[PDB]
């Protein structure tokens with residue numbers, strides 16, 4: 079029963095961790111930061127990135 | 128921040144391609160305008176950067192290889208080329 | 224867009240910018256280029272589908288004459304109490320030093336100043352046949368009528384014998400695939416679609 | 417010129433934008449919708465924008481005679497274009513009221529179409545040292561023919577050095593006039609009186625185009641609008657049905673490609689007689705902004 083209480087607390091924490099971590103996926107771009115894409119490319123390349 | 132030293136590239140005879148020259152710059156400013164006013168560009172091609180972004184931003188280090196080269200042999204410097212230039216003279220690195 | 228699709232299809236509007244231009248300065252017109260051409264002379268706009276064409280005009284065709292020089296701008300800025308403030312082109316627009324640059328240029332690196340504004344020009348002679356640049360852009364879907372090239376025109380057909388079957392259609396330049404059914408009028412009939 | 421008399425607290429009736437009636441909304445071009453609701457991004461006014469009011473007046477009038485004009489300093493208010501604008505034209509032209517000048521004489525309020533100068537560059541008037549002079553190709557939008565003609569042209573304006581005529585040492589303003597009694601006899605509408613009175617002030621040099629448009633006049637509500645993009649200048653008007661006159665539709669494109677930065681409303685004074693005069697309405701200008709709107713379309 080104690081393991082089920084801790085399991086529930088961890089499932090709540092795991093949903094928020096997995097939300098926050100997907101903002102560092104580049105997905106095949108040159109960066110996951112939008113600011114670095116805007117600072118390193120021109121407009122046509124910026125759009126596809 | 129004292130200014131970068133391009134005078135090795137701007138005086139003398141440029142070397143052949145198998146004996147190319149390399150310069151590396153950190154912690155300096157360089158005046159890209161009046162560098163572009165010494166040369167007439169026939170072509171450029173860039174990889175994960177654009178030349179208008181090099182003009183408006185900053186970077187940790189700059190690295191320049193330079194040699195004499197006929198412009199009408201430009202397609203022998205393309206990535207994926209098959210001839211003697213990539214095999215025995217110069218092969219471009221695509222890490223940075 | 225591709226040039227061969229401009230030759231077989233219709234669009235709402237066509238826009239052409241054109242000027243004299245040496246072909247061996249072509250890389251200064253590239254998107255991403257860094258010199259004086261994009262900064263002070265022409266910056267291409269990319270919000271619509273667009274093409275860039277360089278061409279030579281031959282000797283006895285057309286009634287196009289040649290100018291004496293090619294000419295571009297090397298600087299445009301205003302003076303302030305701190306120093307120079309460089310004024311850069313917007314995409315598709317004209318340079319703010321255009322009224323100063325209408326005075327002409329006689330020598331390379333000749334300046335023209337009015338108040339705060341200053342501009343510098345660069346000329347060099349025209350040798351051989353004239354060369355030109357064209358910036359073309361099209362629009363889709365903003366008009367009840369179309370711009371079409373003459374090889375893309377077909378005669379006319381009727382729908383009244385082919386109701387409730389799937390057909391191709393080309394209706395005032397709007398093309399596609401569909402099934403048609405006689406109905407009661409809705410919408411404004413002056414807007415056609 | 418006595419501009420504290422015109423923009424006083426006499427009429428000053430505020431007229432905000434009501435989006436629940438869709439006031440000042442430009443219809444999409446090339447397409448229609450029927451009985452639906454959708455979002456649309458475009459150039460729209462802000463909700464509950466009061467805008468700016470323009471009050472007009474017949475000039476000074478001797479008994480039986482005509483005098484100099486009673487105008488404001490609208491010819492020295494140079495305003496920023498920024499996205500274009502829309503104009504509510506004479507919404508008060510169905511009730512009683514004076515214009516501003518004859519405070520004890522209510523006359524049936526007619527409608528007054530606005531006149532505009534629009535340009536890229538602006539300067540001083542030399543030697544009068546007055547600001548508000550347009551100096552390159554300027555666009556001129558003039559109503560004419562007792563409100564049946566719209567002239568639009570793109571020309572260089574050369575000031576004339578006559579009695580003042582907008583180019584002398586002494587310079588009040590540019591101001592335009594018209595006569596409801598002689599220039600607006602029915603059957604023979606003189607559709608060049610505003611053009612001729614304008615040509616008294618200026619020489620029209622190197623006109624690239626000269627367009628003429630048919631205006632539908634009545635005493636109901638009217639909306640006019642102007643925008644610029646990379647394809648040129650667009651003009652918008654409410655149609656002629658008394659059926660949803662809040663909707664503005666595109667009726668003209670003008671091949672003007674340099675960016676319009678400044679505009680000037682032209683001060684008018686329509687020179688009716690003293691006893692049988694007509695009282696004048698206002699108009700209201702509202703600025704456009706890039707906005708997203710939720711629009712509802714009926715089945716019509």
Ligand SMILES: *[C@@H]1O[C@H](CO)[C@@H](O[C@@H]2O[C@H](CO)[C@@H](O)[C@H](O)[C@H]2NC(C)=O)[C@H](O)[C@H]1NC(C)=O
Pocket residue numbers: 158160161164
């Ligand atoms: C980069 O070098 C150019 C040289 O080409 C500098 O431009 C010169 O500036 C001085 C004073 O501002 C003028 O007297 C020269 O006539 C200029 N020469 C040209 C060709 O324009 C430029 O100032 C340098 N950039 C910076 C930031 O110092």
Ligand SMILES: *[C@@H]1O[C@H](CO)[C@@H](O[C@@H]2O[C@H](CO)[C@@H](O)[C@H](O)[C@H]2NC(C)=O)[C@H](O)[C@H]1NC(C)=O
Pocket residue numbers: 373374
């Ligand atoms: C587009 O214009 C060309 C003009 O070059 C037209 O071609 C000419 O047509 C006439 C009529 O048969 C011939 O006598 C000429 O010899 C043609 N000139 C050439 C160069 O072929 C052409 O017909 C036009 N296109 C369409 C679709 O009408």
Ligand SMILES: *[C@@H]1O[C@H](CO)[C@@H](O[C@@H]2O[C@H](CO)[C@@H](O)[C@H](O)[C@H]2NC(C)=O)[C@H](O)[C@H]1NC(C)=O
Pocket residue numbers: 322325337539551552
């Ligand atoms: C645009 O208008 C300006 C006026 O502001 C014109 O420039 C003037 O040209 C005359 C020619 O006699 C000079 O005397 C003035 O000094 C000029 N004004 C300024 C401020 O320099 C200009 O020519 C016009 N543009 C074009 C293309 O003609």
Ligand SMILES: *[C@@H]1O[C@H](CO)[C@@H](O[C@@H]2O[C@H](CO)[C@@H](O)[C@H](O)[C@H]2NC(C)=O)[C@H](O)[C@H]1NC(C)=O
Pocket residue numbers: 608611626627628
């Ligand atoms: C629009 O109306 C005006 C005024 O009636 C026309 O202006 C005349 O144009 C002709 C030829 O362009 C000139 O010879 C006259 O001097 C102009 N008269 C005036 C009073 O301006 C204009 O032509 C009309 N537009 C079109 C397209 O016909």
Ligand SMILES: CCCCCCCC/C=C\CCCCCCCC(=O)O
Pocket residue numbers: 202203207208209210
């Ligand atoms: C100059 C081509 C004449 C030979 C064509 C017929 C042989 C085809 C077989 C292999 C072709 C591969 C060579 C690719 C040529 C491009 C040269 C280069 O990479 O710079």
Ligand SMILES: CCCCCCCC/C=C\CCCCCCCC(=O)O
Pocket residue numbers: 159162163166168171178179181191250251255256257258
């Ligand atoms: C042409 C001279 C090259 C000199 C190399 C040393 C300077 C390196 C610093 C910046 C290089 C960026 C210039 C890009 C060249 C393309 C010019 C263009 O057409 O926009």
Ligand SMILES: CCCCCCCCCCCCCCCC(=O)O
Pocket residue numbers: 139140141142143144145194195196197198200
């Ligand atoms: C530092 C100057 C002394 C070195 C002198 C080297 C002279 C360069 C000549 C060789 C050019 C090599 C480029 C050939 C390739 C090509 O042009 O296609």
Ligand SMILES: CCCCCCCCCCCCCCCC(=O)O
Pocket residue numbers: 242243244245246248290291292293294295
């Ligand atoms: C309207 C025609 C008269 C004006 C004559 C202008 C034509 C000569 C100027 C050519 C400039 C073209 C751009 C120069 C840069 C280049 O040649 O690459």
Ligand SMILES: *[C@@H]1O[C@H](CO)[C@@H](O)[C@H](O)[C@H]1NC(C)=O
Pocket residue numbers: 282283
């Ligand atoms: C134009 O010049 C070409 C040679 O470049 C020649 O063959 C042709 O006959 C000429 N035509 C005319 C009309 O001059």
Ligand SMILES: *[C@@H]1O[C@H](CO)[C@@H](O)[C@H](O)[C@H]1NC(C)=O
Pocket residue numbers: 304305306
């Ligand atoms: C930048 O700093 C220098 C050094 O004092 C000063 O002379 C100059 O006016 C400054 N410029 C601006 C735009 O602040």
Ligand SMILES: *[C@@H]1O[C@H](CO)[C@@H](O)[C@H](O)[C@H]1NC(C)=O
Pocket residue numbers: 383405406407
């Ligand atoms: C289509 O409908 C209209 C109006 O409903 C009618 O006038 C017309 O005759 C119909 N056409 C056919 C082919 O049925």
Ligand SMILES: *[C@@H]1O[C@H](CO)[C@@H](O)[C@H](O)[C@H]1NC(C)=O
Pocket residue numbers: 419420423488489490493
């Ligand atoms: C007339 O000009 C003055 C100052 O130039 C200004 O304060 C006033 O608002 C102007 N009049 C009107 C009606 O805008």
Ligand SMILES: *[C@@H]1O[C@H](CO)[C@@H](O)[C@H](O)[C@H]1NC(C)=O
Pocket residue numbers: 510635636637
């Ligand atoms: C304006 O007044 C006329 C007559 O006085 C009337 O017929 C008309 O309906 C009024 N306008 C509106 C929008 O009601």
Ligand SMILES: *[C@@H]1O[C@H](CO)[C@@H](O)[C@H](O)[C@H]1NC(C)=O
Pocket residue numbers: 545
């Ligand atoms: C008259 O105009 C000139 C500009 O040509 C300006 O320098 C001067 O200050 C003006 N005079 C007055 C009294 O404002």
Ligand SMILES: *[C@@H]1O[C@H](CO)[C@@H](O)[C@H](O)[C@H]1NC(C)=O
Pocket residue numbers: 572621622
């Ligand atoms: C009108 O155009 C002519 C071209 O023939 C030009 O010479 C003249 O300067 C122009 N007028 C003005 C006021 O610039």
